[PDB]
Design a binder for these strands. Structure first.
Lengths: 209, 56, 121, 114, 120
RNA sequence: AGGACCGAACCGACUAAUGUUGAAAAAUUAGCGGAUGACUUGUGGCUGGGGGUGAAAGGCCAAUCAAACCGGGAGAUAGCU
RNA sequence: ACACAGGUGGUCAGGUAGAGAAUACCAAGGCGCUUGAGAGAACUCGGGUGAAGGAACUAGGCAAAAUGGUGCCGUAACUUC
RNA sequence: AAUUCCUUGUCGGGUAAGUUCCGACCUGCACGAAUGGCGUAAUGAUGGCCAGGCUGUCUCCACCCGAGACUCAGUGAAAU
RNA sequence: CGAUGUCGGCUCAUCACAUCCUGGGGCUGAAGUAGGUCCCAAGGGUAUGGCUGUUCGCCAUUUAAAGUGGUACGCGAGCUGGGUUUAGAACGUCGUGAGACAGUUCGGUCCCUAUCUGCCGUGGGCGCUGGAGAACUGAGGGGGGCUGCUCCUAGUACGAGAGGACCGGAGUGGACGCAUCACUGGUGUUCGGGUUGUCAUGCCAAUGGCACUGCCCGGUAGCUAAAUGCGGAAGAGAUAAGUGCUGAAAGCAUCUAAGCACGAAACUUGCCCCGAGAUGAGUUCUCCCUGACCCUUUAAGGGUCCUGAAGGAACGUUGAAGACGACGACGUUGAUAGGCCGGGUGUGUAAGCGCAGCGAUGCGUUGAGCUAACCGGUACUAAUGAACCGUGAGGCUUAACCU
């Protein structure tokens, strides 16, 4: 049910007997110990939160150290809701990692894609260009129309041409595994995971490819 | 196009609620000459820690 | 690759530029190559042959420009653009002698007739 | 980095021969029949680019029927088998990417090392 | 945006990018000071510290590579004396930078940029 | 030799682009033609409005031209806004 | 109309390369053009390079692109020769 | 036909597709002999049609280099 | 009529259902086969060229299908100016002529920096009645839905054959869409290399400038497609057309009147993203602050002295984060940048010197020299001043528990 917090790093080949040139990311899971278990008695929750990796520990705040006077400590890099149903997971620092699972072949992933600013036209919904010089002048990436006249009277809320790209959650699904490990808790996937590199990312089972 | 109603200052002042200038957070003071500059900038003579370097 | 383009005869049934006039199996393809069947228009041909110019046939490209590829760092790219002519009624190779090396989309065995007339890897 | 170069060599075949490109080479690659495997010739000429820590190129022009068919190789993929250097020469400029269209009584390759 | 590139178009045309530091490090052999725009005292920064590193030995082929970075016969003479060798006492940081206020006419950042070793 | 070619000066204006609250009340930029001739250029002189002048477009005659401008007739007249 | 991207007639013509008042590089000589500095997004303008295809574009190849020199070879329809 | 209404006339050619084009045919509304007829080498910043060449014109868009836009400081319009 | 720019194209679509494809059914003169025909059904999808200004049409070749209509015959303060009505010109025609022609043909200026409404992103206030630091609930909103073919079932059912399914299962494409630079490429004027003319560093050598980036070749990172991975789901629930049970009124019969059952790409979920300004300002978690005085009309304060925490703010080095705000890390408790060192990576056999060669040039020294954006490590340099802000144990009512 629960995921693990990995980290992106960057792409590489992933070789077979055949030696295929397929992308992959060598995900590094440090230990994901249990910070808390959320219960049906403390609202209608049934999730857990956890802590993965270290932080500086001289750059935290006292309210972000005082639930580690109610917990263990590992200097986590964030506190993340991982739903489950019933209890097979428990409040004690379990420090679990990818060895756990090993049959998993559909997993959600939530990197944030590559940030590169916000983009514009032909880079939202990827419009076909106007003509250059053999029929049109002064429009190339300059968007065309945006409505009719008095019906509808207005420009609808639908359509976008210049919204924001990335820097928000996105989820892939599928993604077979080839290796689960415990040496360095390395996880070799199908490939193409969103991010910008070194971008922390779940690796939680999913019900859909 | 252009103004079809002339604005009231309940349109002018509104855009200039968010007019802003400098904010000091106090001026910094050296611990070595008392000079009242802003930190990470020249005092008046390149006075930093226990020096007067490139003295002016 | 691409509709229009000016293709070679691999086979001995015509000669020179034979133009693609339809990418089959759908539309809006920037793709027109490989072992796929595609409607052709002969407008060059060998003049001692049996047909001439302005005819339509079909072909399978047998030496594609972007070639073929299987991920393992091996990309087999032919620099020819040569194709092999086929009946419109029945397909089946019209060549008997086939020059140059063939594609691995017809060594996938869509046409089991065309690898047995053609030399080379 | 810290996650490869100690987890990367595992897939590299480093035990191959080395050349400056411009050679008469005879690559022996595994062709698999679905029943059995065998070693198919690719007499050619390398234009090669240098290794990237895991990725190389060893594009050969066959000149199969006067017109070559071209196949890049890498020597990391376990089905590449073995490559002979045989004769070895080179063009004065190290990268061949357009000196392979030179042709018309070209094949001259030479060695120096200096 | 600009992510994992150190390329820079400055406020210079291409050719003036590669032909401005002969009047800016040509000033760093005269009086080892310069007062110039401060983030261009960071783009100067990266030019000046490899020069000092090349200035370790005169050779023949370092004296002629100072004809491939500048060509002022007068200043290469100054080179390879204490310019280079004196700065072998540390590894990098052969200039301190040091930060200042603004320029009098309009605004533009002021810098103090000067070589670490002279008499300091 | 030639109402000859190519092509600078020079002279002209066929295309496009940029301009289009312009740098510009028709330009600028890249092209284009002419370039010893029915060529071109300076200087001064000389043709006046129901007229001149025009290789003719009703074209031009001080950003203007289907009969210029200034003053007078004049406060033209306006069943019209 | 401007310390205005415009207009202005006459005289002088170095050096190197080059047929040359072309053109490139330099002189003598004279200039850097009366807002400046940063970030370096969309989009625009002005340039430069593009895998594969090659007029499918479009009313139209609009434009760009290639072509380009000297000597020599060699040149068809047709002709007022 | 810069003329033909009926009319994408009809046939032939070129195109796979040729309401355009080119050659015939004559169904000449409403051509025709100095307000000249019919031809013509040569010529054209000429109209129409085609071919080779070349290519970002297009397929199907990418990357790069400058000048803006954008941020800061000084000065500071406009129509309406 | 004190100016509501015509048509077509382009660009961008959006909406309706009288549905073209895909989905479900009924009747059939529906064996199957491909259909005929009608009912239901808007989830999603729904062609490229030749010719023509034609939208339209015709033709050609595809397609699962190339749906129809509306939206100022949608869209020119978004593009074009081809059709089309200016002045030029010409033809045929009419007219006495000037001239004319809802006949014809060639040439012939598309402006506007957006105040306002509206949209697309992104911030800033102020608040949820002690001050802060976090994690979610999910009120609601938005995104997403395509399909051929092959193989299997099965050459089975069906059919005398020819031919040829159903239901289901699996595989592989096409178009579309999401992610990613590892592969494969593209570019790559911070890089490497070659090179013509000329000018230069006094000159030789060797270097440098200019000549579109001088020209040209190669190429790392990054960005990127033509590259590469992934995606449209299963499954529930409730239904449509329609199919039903059980069954009276109306001893029969009757899916309906009572009562019960199913049933479609539609519908509600499931999937994916925003999401407590959700002023309905929720909950959950954590942390910090528990001094005097005076002057009062006094559950509202006013004023004075002492304090001010957690945390925040700013400041600085900066970031795979960025228009700007914003968001992120680090700041000597140090790898946050740069430098530095090593490595890699990319170019490809330096210069100088020797030798040979008349030279051109070659060869050796030396596959050398150089080398970004990359990788490993390293405090050399830059991260200096604390300042500042933020307060001091929580208004009332009522209830419950403690007394």
């Amino acid at each position: 049910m629960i995921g693990l917090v990995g980290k992106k790093v960057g792409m590489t080949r992933i070789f077979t007997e055949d030696g295929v040139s397929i992308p992959v990311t060598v995900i590094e899971v440090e230990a994901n110990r249990v910070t808390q278990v959320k219960d049906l008695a403390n609202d209608g929750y049934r999730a857990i939160q956890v802590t993965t990796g270290a932080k500086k520990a001289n750059r935290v705040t006292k309210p972000e150290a005082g639930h580690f006077a109610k917990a263990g400590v590992e200097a986590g890099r964030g506190l993340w809701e991982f739903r489950l149903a019933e209890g097979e997971e428990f409040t004690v620092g379990q420090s679990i990692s990818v060895e756990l699972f090993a049959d998993v072949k559909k997993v959600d992933v939530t990197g944030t894609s590559k940030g590169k600013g916000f983009a514009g036209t032909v880079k939202r919904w990827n419009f076909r260009t106007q003509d250059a010089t053999h029929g049109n002048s002064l429009s190339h990436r300059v968007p065309g129309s945006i409505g009719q006249n008095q019906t509808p009277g207005k420009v609808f809320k639908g359509k976008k041409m210049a919204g924001q790209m990335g820097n928000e959650r996105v989820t892939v699904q599928s993604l077979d595994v080839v290796r689960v490990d415990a040496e360095r808790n390395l996880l070799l996937v199908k490939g193409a995971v969103p991010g910008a590199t070194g971008s922390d990312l779940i690796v939680k089972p999913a019900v859909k490819a | 196009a252009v103004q079809q109603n002339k604005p009231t200052r309940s349109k002018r002042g509104m855009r200039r609620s968010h007019d802003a200038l400098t904010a000091v957070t106090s001026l910094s003071v050296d611990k070595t000459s008392g000079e009242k500059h802003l930190r990470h900038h020249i005092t008046a003579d390149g006075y930093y820690r226990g020096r007067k370097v490139i003295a002016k | 690759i691409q509709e229009q383009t000016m293709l070679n005869v691999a086979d001995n049934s015509g000669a020179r530029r034979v133009m693609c006039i339809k990418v089959l199996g759908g539309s809006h393809r920037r793709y027109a190559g490989v072992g796929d069947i595609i409607k052709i228009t002969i407008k060059e041909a060998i003049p001692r042959g049996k047909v001439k110019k302005g005819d339509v046939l079909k072909a399978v490209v047998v030496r594609t420009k972007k070639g073929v590829r299987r991920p393992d760092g091996s990309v087999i790219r032919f620099d020819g653009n040569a194709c092999v002519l086929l009946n419109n009624n029945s397909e089946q190779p019209i060549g008997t002698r086939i020059f140059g090396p063939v594609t691995r989309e017809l060594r996938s065995e869509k046409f089991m007739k065309i690898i047995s007339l053609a030399p080379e890897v | 980095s810290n996650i490869i170069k100690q987890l990367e060599q595992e897939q590299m075949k480093q035990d191959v021969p080395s050349f400056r490109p411009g050679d008469t080479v005879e690559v022996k690659v595994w062709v698999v029949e679905g029943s059995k495997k065998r070693l198919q010739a690719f007499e050619g000429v390398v234009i090669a680019i240098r290794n990237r820590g895991l990725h190389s190129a060893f594009t050969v022009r066959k000149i199969s029927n006067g017109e070559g068919v071209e196949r890049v190789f890498q020597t990391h993929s376990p089905v590449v088998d073995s490559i002979s250097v045989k004769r070895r020469g080179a063009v004065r400029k190290a990268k061949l990417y357009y000196l392979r269209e030179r042709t018309g009584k070209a094949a001259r390759i030479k060695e120096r090392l200096n | 945006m600009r992510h994992r590139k150190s390329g820079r178009q400055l406020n210079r045309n291409s050719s003036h990018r590669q032909a401005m530091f002969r009047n800016m490090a040509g000033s760093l052999v005269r009086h080892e000071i310069i007062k110039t725009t401060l983030p261009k005292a960071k783009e100067l920064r990266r030019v000046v510290e490899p020069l000092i590193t090349l200035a370790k030995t005169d050779s023949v082929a370092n004296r002629r590579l100072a004809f491939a970075r500048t060509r002022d016969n007068e200043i290469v003479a100054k080179l390879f004396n204490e310019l280079g060798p004196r700065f072998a006492s540390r590894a990098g940081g052969y200039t301190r930078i040091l930060k200042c206020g603004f320029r009098a006419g309009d605004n533009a950042p002021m810098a103090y940029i000067e070589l670490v070793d002279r008499s300091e």
